[PDB]
Structure 1
């Protein structure tokens, strides 16, 4: 068999009170994390730096999530969604009564619609 290793990209809190909102930092990556998971060449890792995805499946501050911008995302999958055109968020894509929403694993965070100022950047396919 064969193993893979993808770049880990940096990102920081967008707004001042928007821990869920994140923005990619400037600069190349200096960290490459391996995995058994094979993905597209645009695949990369992100470091969970908050607790909005921390449940009572869970992604605590310090966990790495592998993002693949080349795989189709559907309700039930976790993904990185882009909002406002610049910032992005890590949520679970779901269907609440037929409506498409981004859901945080931590109930202390609000759910967001994904319609106009919302597009899907990639599927989460693995974690460390």
Structure 2
């Protein structure tokens, strides 16, 4: 983790995998984002979309095209082209301490 890494809290159910699937990042978990670490296909990342909004997804590539893939099958895949940029690689994830008291 570089000096640029920062923690974010997962929002929504787009990265919550179906029961029996892994990994899975339910709403409420914390994820560590590191801007200084490259994101390769298969890695989890934070990406910046058209409206400059941040999104937490898995970066994948198929037939030469890059997409932002959610772990929740009910959510759509997002083409990652010119208007999209990678903010950082997700390198860690844990439940906050408070979860256990």
Scaled to the shorter chain, the TM-score interval is: 0.7 to 0.9
Q: Distance in 2 between matches of 1:46 and 1:59?
A: 12
The worse-fitting range, judged by mean Cα deviation, of 110-119 and 48-57 is 48-57
> Greater relative contact order (Cα 8 A, min sep 6): structure 1 or 2?
2
Deviation at 1:97, TM superposition (A): 2.8
Deviation at 1:88, TM superposition (A): 1.3
Normalized per residue, the structure richer in strand is 1
Question: How do residues 43-122 of structure 1 correspond to structure 2 at under 5 angstroms?
Answer: 43-56=5-18, 58-84=24-50, 86-122=52-88
What is the TM-score normalised by the length of structure 1?
A: 0.67
Q: Distance in 1 between matches of 2:45 and 2:61?
A: 14
Deviation at 1:85, TM superposition (A): 5.2
Look at both structures and tell me which one has the larger radius of gyration over its CA atoms.
Answer: 1
Residue by residue over 1:76-121, the C-alpha shift from the partner in whole angstroms, topping out at 9 and shown as x without a partner, is 1000000115211100001123311000000111000111110100
CA RMSD in angstroms, aligned pairs only = 1.5
Partner SS state of residue 62, structure 1:
coil
What is the TM-score normalised by the length of structure 2?
A: 0.84
Partner SS state of residue 59, structure 1:
coil
